[PDB]
Amino acid sequence: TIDSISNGILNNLLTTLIQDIVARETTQQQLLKTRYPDLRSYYFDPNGSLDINGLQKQQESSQYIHCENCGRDVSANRLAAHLQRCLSR
Amino acid sequence: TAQLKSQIQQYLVESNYELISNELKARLLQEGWVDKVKDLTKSEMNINESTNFTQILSTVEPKALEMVSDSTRETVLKQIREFLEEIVDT
Amino acid sequence: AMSICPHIQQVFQNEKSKDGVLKTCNAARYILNHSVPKEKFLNTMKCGTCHEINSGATFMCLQCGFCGCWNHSHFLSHSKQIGHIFGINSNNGLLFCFKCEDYIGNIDLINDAILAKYWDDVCTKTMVPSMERRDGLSGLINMGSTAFMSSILQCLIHNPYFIRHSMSQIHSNNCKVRSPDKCFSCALDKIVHELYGALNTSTNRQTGFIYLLTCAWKINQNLAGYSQQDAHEFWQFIINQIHQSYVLDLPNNNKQCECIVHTVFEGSLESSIVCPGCQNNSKTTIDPFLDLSLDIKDKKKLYECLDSFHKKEQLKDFNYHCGECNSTQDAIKQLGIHKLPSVLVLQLKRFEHLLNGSNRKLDDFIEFPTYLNMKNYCSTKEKGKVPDIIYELIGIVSHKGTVNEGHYIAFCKISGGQWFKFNDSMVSSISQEEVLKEQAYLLFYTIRQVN
Amino acid sequence: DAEIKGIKPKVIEEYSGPSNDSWKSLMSSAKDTPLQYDHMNRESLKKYFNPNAQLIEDPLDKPIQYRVCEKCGKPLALTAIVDHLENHC
Amino acid sequence: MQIFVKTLTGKTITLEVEPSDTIENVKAKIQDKEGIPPDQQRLIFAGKQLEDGRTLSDYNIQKESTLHLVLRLRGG
């Protein structure tokens, strides 16, 4: 019947799309797991505190950067000021 | 005979299939069903600790079929049916 | 201990059989990239047995010309009856083994089969991405007032057109200056290098960003990160500089620029001028655009803002005399889309000016959709209606603070559908629903479906 | 909802067992045919989009596909690896 | 010639200008209409911010073209 053929058409469309999507998902995850045997998911923190490696925000100004210009090491959160004083040659 | 069905389908292809497929895709995409199915897939992959396609599909397909909104379902069916009453004799 | 299909290993034990296979895969994929929709329906989605179209997935046989459906087990029947255990899914080109009952997705050679001829060399010179770098995820520390820059850069860092450009070595291949302390693109390629690969051979992965900052200081110190600035202005400035670098690397009546910016971001508005009497006309002006700026007052949704944007206006300060109705008139102006860009960038005008000369931030939440339909905004009808035109949200920049002082943050979506928040050095997982609850300032949309 | 009797004579009139045809028959056509996109209609793209727009269909399907040079460490798109190896590494 | 400017609210205003007119002059006219100083103004055309010292003709800006006006949102 018309009703039946229409149901079959819709089923055809849905099963085609589903099989495509699922095949793509399974192939991608298979690839990721095979390439990277020790694979870990990026961390999700419900508390909104930890990064994708499950770490908190690092202490600045505890970190420093070595400015290749002039040969001076400069605390990173003060780097721009240095460049304003350094690039002004 | 049942060659008839295939014949009719051939006609359907030569003529509108794109409009249906695209409208379906847009509807399922816009209502969030596609991403729900992605989340379901990640969840099942994590629960069964497996990427084997057959076993994951075996659990995914029925539910995914149920998740199709009634609105989209009846609208797309309605549209196909609209297209069918054109080219069949009763 | 995940296994690999032993059947393809078996075939691959013989070099010529392997070559036949890879040749056929390459040929098939070329066909898939070069076949019109109807031919595809009739010749790759038609079951060889029942002759139905789209009887579930249809598979094209690796060993013969037969196509077979899923619903009636007809490829399954080809496999049982002829002994051909490998078939290709006509929706994605992926190769199925009917003995394993699983797809082969984890063989690098198969995924990149077009390089099979040179595969040995490919394996000697290069390695797969490191787990840490594979998604290019790393934070960029605040080096002064650089939040307006990095927030912009992460959406660029996750843009497929840009990543395709950069990883293709186009600037590197063609740069006439070939120094990252002068060339913005060389520096960018260095950034991509630092984030996805490894410099030869803790302070990690900051070199490219520092080069970019040095270039910026050299062209405009004010926009170089010491002081707070406008992210949209930085966007237009940097894309213009990139465009200038494209023009620079050229060896050579062409009004439209042919650069990467103008093949991705450039659209055109149609402005019509019509007589309110005759309502026929019209005087049409075409304006290029790289992004859209939207008013938000008294509105709650992005579609409302676009509607307002697209809304007709009557000019009261334009001198206009109609020749068709022979009278002085106040012309009607309307903006619509003449041409859409591949990537659509939106700025919400989250500010207002007061009579006392001060400004105020608008913190009003504006709802924005995960998927955006532009059909109501296209100027030109076909022999009519305009078809569906849908974009996918891929990026958000948000601001916290006031008009004259604040902070930018970025949100980016990656594969599998997961969202991450990029706050300087901190990359974190975030759900889609919360991103969607954010106060959006900038939005990045990639073209997804065009009917 | 009602019963189908046959196929209208005019469609057969002007349009029209196991098939003998072969999918590799498309190669001839495929050799002469420009790159095609799925669910982005070409004519609508011509009317509403620019003629030289770059286009990537479904850009977030899988993570970026690339490899890294052992000598200079550059991340290379698959279509760029070979010449990078010829005169750029 | 007449050109247009689309303000923050979306309201469009009209200016009478010559191709040789400087960005400073246009911004002055905008100040004269809206009461907003030039240093607070950002004038956008064709994906570029219009720069002081340059002319309309330098940017190939013609009759009845529309410029888009915005402000700055600073963040550091």
Ligand SMILES: [Zn+2]
């Ligand atoms: Zn220094």
Ligand SMILES: [Zn+2]
């Ligand atoms: Zn069948």
Ligand SMILES: [Zn+2]
């Ligand atoms: Zn076969």
Ligand SMILES: [Zn+2]
């Ligand atoms: Zn197998």
Ligand SMILES: [Zn+2]
């Ligand atoms: Zn360079």
Ligand SMILES: [Zn+2]
């Ligand atoms: Zn260009």
Ligand SMILES: [Zn+2]
């Ligand atoms: Zn009139």
Ligand SMILES: [Zn+2]
């Ligand atoms: Zn290299």
